[PDB]
């Protein structure tokens, strides 16, 4: 009863950020780690142990 | 040369495991798996032990004519989402208490009817046959004979009762009790036949606690299920 | 009569393309897709193999011979051709018998079907059956145990341009009995039992739930038995009768009935591969 | 009582005035000028056979070389990806299983099912058949998923709307998480093993704290049951899949979803969701006998991963991002690159 109200009050008072910043951060991470992924960028047959 | 040696080790170990799976596949193909399901206070507890102890989660083993069967209970879940793991069984056994129609306050039978209807139309259980058991025969007979409680008040469609033609009453039985029993049987078979589609069926049986012939009944029904499946496989039925 | 001879070439040539196409399609469908790898489907694979040889090895040479009316190869080659023809013919029926017996075990013995038939036993049965087909086919025909005795026969063996079928009574009777007469009673008995079981099940279901609720089985059994009996029955009685008494059946009737017999290889895929799984397999590839 | 309910309403009212104001511009507008990745084609490299029945779960090892899978015949098999040779076959006391996991150290393997017991096996035992070491009990409902937080403690989610953090040495529940109404189906751990999420059956996702024992936030974008959940490599996002064939990507910091993936040509369910090493590609299974590959930033299909004759119920992407493996009810496991 009262514990539910206390928990709801605890969760309500949480700082937030603009969605633009989060989208920019996600795009930055995706751009930064683009080269490493073999699924995204093809790799030579020699480097592939599955051939 | 150590590398060659290690490849040699892997081959020999695959060699034992591969052999072991083959022995195992034969046993898993020999046995048949059943699912036991019923409402509360139905008498599933009576059926699991009273029938198997003489014949010889909860997994039960019994042998009939040197043919392996394996029965799973459901332990002691208004929603049912684990039922998707039971779409490869041979048959599903349904046990419902026949005597509890007046007792409640939705009539308990009505809840059992709703459960049976929901199970019948499940997407994952489109090709699973149901063996239906009706317990509490003597209680039902005693309630019908010299009983203050009336079927019509609880179930209003009973007003028109005509024992179904081809009625085969047991010896020395009053017509009223048979007309009562066949009403419930037809009520369940209506739901069974509404969307049968010819792929799966429902087998009505009447039983009590004392009788032990049900173990042979299950065997005969399983044989019939396999026969009908094979006949439909080759476009003969 | 240029038009008639030319027209016959059109009919014989079409009959071989269909035979090749059907069997190669069935074989590719069985081999490529792993969901069709089933104990029963091995027999269909074998049956198909025998037909392909008949379509590729026997039919075109016979058509060329009946068109030219003069055999242009060696005597050893025509003996080999006869051996190949008899091998394919006597191997294209035992497979049907085996399939019928397998269906009998699958329907009338539901609780022991898995144990009785395994992936290992199917190979044993296939190897054993193809072997018998060879023993009648090559051992008597290659060694000259089967040569006839009358003057015309010997005149044809001596000549290097004619090669026709002349045999004694014993070989003809034995080959006919081994190839056709034995595998008929077994199939009849099997299908009668299966039909009885189907009728029993239909009566049971009608008694159980007739109020709220044999044609398909009759139609299917009628097709599967009638096509085979019609295709292969007349030849295996004409074969006996022309040896029992001579100067009764002329050569053209014999050849016509024999060629009627050869058509049976073009219908087995149409009958034994009508399941929806085969339909979706055919739609998946080359479609 | 009712005044306390008014107090809760007071608290509920503030969030909307906050999430509405925070939403400046969606990611769809922001991510518009980035060129598409183009068509990506993938072909089967290896095929694994040996399972007598359908497959429910699998988990890649930490060396990208070995993996473990469980079936309904009661058998865990540990494979070798490069050589396609089996290594172990672990019999089970029961038959029905629903989850499996692999240790970071590669010496323990866990598996639990309909029975209310989570077991742990010792792979690295000298001169012995691998054997049961511990049996964890205490749940009143069927287990659904379990992951190794460390080599000594496991977190498990059950079907009685509860989650717990176990201890291997003693076998007792250290912390218990409550608050869900429907059965909890799946969970995923953060890379730093600091927080873990869980998508329940009541169309709701929650974020928990392992050390404290209480739920920080809650997202309710979906409308039906949630069957799978993954977690972004960065640690500031996670994507969930629901029965309505819709994939949604949420955000921890923004506290609301940013982009949803759906198509009008699909009406089937979803069973598994996994990301890639770069986070650019989202891989999701389906009930349409095939798999799909989405784009994280564009919400556009970039390929079709088909070839299975039965439904797909498992998925996993290697730590090094070398290959992706799919499991199906057809008793076949496939490894694709
Ligand atoms: N007179 C009579 N009583 C019966 C008969 N069959 C069952 N009963 C009674 O019905 C009771 C039903 O309870 P159980 O079968 O023991 O178990 P249960 O409580 O129904 O089990 P759950 O449904 O799993 O909760 C039995 O304990 C018997 O006393 C019968 O044929 N005749
Ligand atoms: C020329 N073709 C032959 C002629 C006679 C014959 C065949 C097949 C089986 C037999 O038992 C036979 O007697 C045919 O293949």
Coordinates of N, CA and C in Angstrom, one line a residue, chain C residues 184-260:
Chain C
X184 N 1.4 -60.9 -57.7 CA 0.0 -60.5 -57.9 C -0.9 -60.9 -56.7
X185 N -0.8 -62.1 -56.3 CA -1.6 -62.6 -55.2 C -1.3 -61.9 -53.9
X186 N 0.0 -61.6 -53.7 CA 0.5 -60.9 -52.5 C -0.2 -59.5 -52.4
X187 N -0.1 -58.8 -53.5 CA -0.7 -57.5 -53.6 C -2.2 -57.5 -53.4
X188 N -2.9 -58.5 -54.0 CA -4.3 -58.6 -53.9 C -4.7 -58.8 -52.4
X189 N -4.0 -59.8 -51.7 CA -4.3 -60.1 -50.4 C -4.0 -58.9 -49.4
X190 N -2.9 -58.2 -49.7 CA -2.6 -57.0 -48.9 C -3.7 -56.0 -49.0
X191 N -4.0 -55.7 -50.2 CA -5.0 -54.5 -50.4 C -6.4 -54.9 -50.0
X192 N -6.7 -56.2 -50.0 CA -8.0 -56.6 -49.5 C -8.0 -56.4 -48.0
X193 N -6.9 -56.8 -47.3 CA -6.9 -56.6 -45.8 C -6.9 -55.1 -45.5
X194 N -6.2 -54.3 -46.2 CA -6.2 -52.9 -45.9 C -7.6 -52.3 -46.1
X195 N -8.3 -52.7 -47.2 CA -9.6 -52.2 -47.4 C -10.6 -52.6 -46.3
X196 N -10.4 -53.9 -45.8 CA -11.3 -54.3 -44.7 C -11.0 -53.5 -43.5
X197 N -9.8 -53.2 -43.2 CA -9.5 -52.3 -42.0 C -10.1 -50.9 -42.2
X198 N -10.0 -50.3 -43.4 CA -10.5 -49.0 -43.6 C -12.0 -49.0 -43.5
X199 N -12.7 -50.1 -44.0 CA -14.2 -50.2 -43.8 C -14.5 -50.3 -42.3
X200 N -13.7 -51.1 -41.6 CA -14.0 -51.2 -40.1 C -13.9 -49.9 -39.4
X201 N -12.9 -49.1 -39.7 CA -12.7 -47.8 -39.1 C -13.8 -46.9 -39.5
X202 N -14.2 -46.9 -40.7 CA -15.3 -46.0 -41.1 C -16.6 -46.4 -40.4
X203 N -16.9 -47.7 -40.3 CA -18.1 -48.1 -39.6 C -18.0 -47.7 -38.1
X204 N -16.8 -47.8 -37.5 CA -16.7 -47.4 -36.1 C -17.0 -45.9 -35.9
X205 N -16.4 -45.1 -36.8 CA -16.6 -43.6 -36.7 C -18.0 -43.2 -36.9
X206 N -18.7 -43.9 -37.9 CA -20.1 -43.6 -38.2 C -21.0 -44.0 -37.0
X207 N -20.7 -45.1 -36.4 CA -21.5 -45.5 -35.2 C -21.2 -44.5 -34.1
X208 N -20.0 -44.1 -33.9 CA -19.7 -43.2 -32.8 C -20.3 -41.8 -32.9
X209 N -20.1 -41.2 -34.1 CA -20.5 -39.8 -34.2 C -21.3 -39.6 -35.5
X210 N -22.1 -40.5 -36.0 CA -22.9 -40.3 -37.2 C -23.9 -39.3 -37.1
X211 N -24.6 -39.1 -35.9 CA -25.7 -38.2 -35.8 C -25.3 -36.8 -36.1
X212 N -24.2 -36.3 -35.6 CA -23.8 -35.0 -35.9 C -23.2 -34.9 -37.2
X213 N -22.4 -35.9 -37.7 CA -21.8 -35.9 -39.0 C -22.8 -36.3 -40.1
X214 N -17.3 -45.9 -48.0 CA -16.0 -46.2 -48.5 C -15.9 -45.7 -50.0
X215 N -15.5 -44.5 -50.2 CA -15.4 -43.9 -51.5 C -13.9 -43.5 -51.8
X216 N -13.3 -42.7 -51.0 CA -11.9 -42.4 -51.2 C -11.0 -43.6 -51.3
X217 N -11.1 -44.5 -50.3 CA -10.3 -45.7 -50.3 C -10.6 -46.5 -51.5
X218 N -11.9 -46.7 -51.9 CA -12.2 -47.5 -53.0 C -11.6 -46.9 -54.3
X219 N -11.7 -45.6 -54.5 CA -11.1 -44.9 -55.6 C -9.6 -45.1 -55.7
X220 N -8.9 -44.9 -54.6 CA -7.5 -45.0 -54.6 C -7.0 -46.4 -54.9
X221 N -7.6 -47.4 -54.2 CA -7.2 -48.8 -54.4 C -7.6 -49.2 -55.8
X222 N -8.7 -48.8 -56.3 CA -9.1 -49.1 -57.7 C -8.0 -48.6 -58.7
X223 N -7.6 -47.3 -58.5 CA -6.6 -46.8 -59.4 C -5.3 -47.5 -59.3
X224 N -4.8 -47.7 -58.1 CA -3.5 -48.3 -57.9 C -3.4 -49.7 -58.4
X225 N -4.5 -50.5 -58.2 CA -4.5 -51.9 -58.7 C -4.8 -52.0 -60.2
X226 N -5.8 -51.2 -60.7 CA -6.3 -51.3 -62.0 C -5.2 -50.9 -63.0
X227 N -4.5 -49.8 -62.8 CA -3.5 -49.3 -63.8 C -2.5 -50.4 -64.0
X228 N -1.9 -51.0 -62.9 CA -0.9 -52.0 -63.0 C -1.4 -53.2 -63.7
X229 N -2.6 -53.7 -63.2 CA -3.2 -54.9 -63.8 C -3.4 -54.7 -65.3
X230 N -4.0 -53.6 -65.7 CA -4.3 -53.3 -67.1 C -3.0 -53.2 -67.9
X231 N -2.0 -52.6 -67.4 CA -0.8 -52.4 -68.2 C 0.0 -53.7 -68.3
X232 N 0.1 -54.6 -67.3 CA 1.0 -55.7 -67.3 C 0.3 -57.1 -67.3
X233 N -1.0 -57.1 -67.4 CA -1.7 -58.4 -67.5 C -1.7 -59.1 -68.8
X234 N -2.1 -58.4 -69.9 CA -2.2 -59.1 -71.2 C -0.9 -59.7 -71.7
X235 N 0.2 -59.0 -71.5 CA 1.5 -59.5 -72.0 C 1.9 -60.8 -71.4
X236 N 1.6 -60.9 -70.0 CA 2.1 -62.1 -69.3 C 1.1 -63.3 -69.4
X237 N 0.1 -63.2 -70.2 CA -0.7 -64.4 -70.7 C -0.5 -64.7 -72.1
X238 N -0.3 -63.6 -72.9 CA 0.1 -63.8 -74.3 C 1.5 -64.6 -74.4
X239 N 2.4 -64.2 -73.5 CA 3.7 -64.8 -73.5 C 3.6 -66.3 -73.2
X240 N 2.7 -66.7 -72.3 CA 2.5 -68.2 -72.1 C 1.8 -68.8 -73.3
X241 N 0.8 -68.2 -73.8 CA 0.0 -68.9 -74.8 C 0.7 -69.0 -76.2
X242 N 1.6 -68.1 -76.5 CA 2.2 -68.3 -77.8 C 3.3 -69.4 -77.8
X243 N 3.7 -69.7 -76.6 CA 4.7 -70.9 -76.5 C 3.9 -72.2 -76.3
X244 N 2.8 -72.1 -75.6 CA 2.0 -73.4 -75.4 C 1.6 -73.9 -76.8
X245 N 1.1 -73.1 -77.7 CA 0.7 -73.5 -79.0 C 1.3 -72.5 -80.0
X246 N 1.9 -73.0 -81.1 CA 2.5 -72.1 -82.1 C 1.4 -71.7 -83.1
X247 N 1.8 -70.7 -84.0 CA 1.0 -70.3 -85.1 C -0.4 -69.7 -84.6
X248 N -0.3 -69.0 -83.4 CA -1.5 -68.5 -82.8 C -1.5 -67.0 -82.7
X249 N -0.4 -66.4 -82.2 CA -0.3 -64.9 -82.1 C 0.9 -64.5 -83.0
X250 N 0.6 -63.5 -83.8 CA 1.6 -63.0 -84.7 C 2.6 -62.0 -84.0
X251 N 3.6 -61.7 -84.7 CA 4.7 -60.9 -84.1 C 4.2 -59.5 -83.8
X252 N 3.4 -58.8 -84.6 CA 3.0 -57.5 -84.4 C 2.1 -57.3 -83.1
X253 N 1.2 -58.3 -82.9 CA 0.4 -58.3 -81.7 C 1.3 -58.4 -80.4
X254 N 2.3 -59.3 -80.5 CA 3.3 -59.4 -79.4 C 4.0 -58.1 -79.1
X255 N 4.5 -57.5 -80.2 CA 5.3 -56.3 -80.0 C 4.4 -55.1 -79.5
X256 N 3.2 -55.1 -80.0 CA 2.2 -54.0 -79.5 C 1.9 -54.2 -78.0
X257 N 1.6 -55.4 -77.6 CA 1.3 -55.6 -76.2 C 2.6 -55.3 -75.3
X258 N 3.7 -55.8 -75.8 CA 5.0 -55.5 -75.1 C 5.2 -54.0 -74.9
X259 N 4.9 -53.2 -76.0 CA 5.1 -51.8 -75.9 C 4.0 -51.1 -75.0
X260 N 2.8 -51.7 -75.0 CA 1.8 -51.3 -74.0 C 2.4 -51.5 -72.6

